[PDB]
Amino acid sequence: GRQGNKFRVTCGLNNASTVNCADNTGAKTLTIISVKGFHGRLNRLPRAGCGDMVVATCKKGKPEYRKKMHTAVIIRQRRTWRRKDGVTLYFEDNAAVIVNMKGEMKGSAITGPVSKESADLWPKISSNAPTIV
Template structure:
């Protein structure tokens, strides 16, 4: 007479809310660790799980130091056909004192970060531009709130005339009141 042991499977047939696998940590990061703009960044030197709280604490420390010792840069799209594609704002002009934020119609000093080849404007050239679109809400005098999907600027010369011949995308009417009619 043979005795057979009956095996009981305690696993469920179906799992509704399955916990995701965490994966494995192979080594330190080797790609995607180049600083795009600014001077300071966080980089992992050994493999470890980093919590969101640790990342946020490092970001806050960098921001505090940058406010005291450096500048926090803003990248903008170019909304004309002058040849530049991306700008990096380095200073806001036209307001009394040191203005920290730029709104629609403000003139800025910017550096060209990306440009089309064989065009008069090339990379790392310092230019002036006027802000035409911002992601931050802009309230008109009649109470309408305008908000765009991107931050964009049009490159201008010293007299305030645009260097390109066409402007792409939506432009606010408030620029006419600020004498940017061309």
């Protein structure tokens, strides 16, 4: 469901990295299991940056979301990444929103800023984002 390409965004989120859920779906935190499109290497852990659709499990939330495997998109990250126009930028916390394969967000609202890279990749996230940074 993603539209277009994404430039180089350094991936600061690993396997077993706990992020927050900015949705209103009753899931609090997710831990990344593996990253869609990740090209494997020996002893390398899967890596995710902004706008990267990951496969994550919810270890904290309401019972219909806990102890299950969902699909999310990283909207912000604490790792410092550089834009193509010489802008160096980083957020306050790692957050994600639950989307399906077709790319529509399960929730209805997003809390906090949403990075441009994830907003342009997924048109559904940008519509429900408060601000795009």
